[PDB]
């Protein structure tokens, strides 16, 4: 039923633009939307990655690796994913092990790669593949990892064990002013609810 | 260490705006970035989304999601449902309200999450994440009547929790639908449970 007619530039930095989005709405009448895309996709199935990395070894609990860092949009430090955008020409996989490793210092295994999924979809086109990967910490190359921050790029990493997640990110929540990233705490929330 | 020095309006919407971020990076060192806000923002958020557990005895517990075109996507998109807080209501009030227009569906509250971010390379934007069950077995939720606004034209999508991730994946493959990457983050995470 619903479609879009046109999209019309109204303002476009370095990375982020804006357009007046016209589309045909399901009774047969011409609307528009403010819609924000990034300049930054080519023939990427999605503009980034954002990685799942499950830490295992022997004789551990999982955890879950997340990284914590400033956020200019948000005015402040924020929990998140290891993520970046997709070099283009990259795949999501070689993206997400990339990223992990720049962010984090482990290398890691894929496990499985998500079709291209939506991170705001009533205001923006972005896509990501959120892309499962396992560490092995009992691997030599994963013992005492540092993370090779890109320039501009200070991350810094937080391993919680998978088994208590929610309550481990809600004591950081409550001890910090710093914001939980809402695909963790979607994921914390189901490890909760399963 | 790092913060924010001075926001630059660039272009300003109806709905959304694009700024000019100067921050101080952890060097010393001041720097740039363009970031995207809702007009919108009064609220402990931007806006809500829905957890919404049905259930109905002797049937599977379902995730109730709903499929939207959005314009930004150019697409139609598989969500939790969802909408933007109103100035003076509580995250909570406008999780029930939400639900019931987008779903019909008439739900208590189980949990809600502090404010999480959308998208923090990108955004300010955030979003309480609350829990709510249905008894699917009460009257109310027999026959539910969806009461969309003005201009949102919305289709229910009821699946099973225990199966989720491979039921998404289902309609992703079949219907070239774009599945929400919080609903994704949830679906792995059942999976990845115990
Ligand atoms: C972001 C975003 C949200 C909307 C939206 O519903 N816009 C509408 C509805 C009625 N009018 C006059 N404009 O557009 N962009
Ligand atoms: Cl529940
Ligand atoms: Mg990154
Ligand atoms: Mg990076
Ligand atoms: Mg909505
Ligand atoms: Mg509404």
New interface residues.
Partial sequence: ????ISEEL??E??????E??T?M??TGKT?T??????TTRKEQTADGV?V?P?LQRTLHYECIVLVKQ??????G??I?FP?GLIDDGETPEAAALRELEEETGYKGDIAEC???????????????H?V?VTINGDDAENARPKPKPGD?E?VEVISLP?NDLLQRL?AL?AEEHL?????????????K??
């Fill in positions: 039923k619903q479609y879009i109204i303002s930095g370095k990375w982020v633009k804006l007046k989005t589309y709405d399901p609307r939307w403010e819609s924000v895309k990034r954002a799942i499950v400033f956020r200019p949009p948000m005015g430090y924020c998140e993520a998500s079709p291209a999924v939506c991170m705001d979809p009533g205001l923006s086109n972005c896509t990501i959120i499962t501009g200070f998978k809600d929540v914001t939980v990233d809402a695909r963790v705490y979607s994921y914390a929330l189901a490890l609810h399963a």
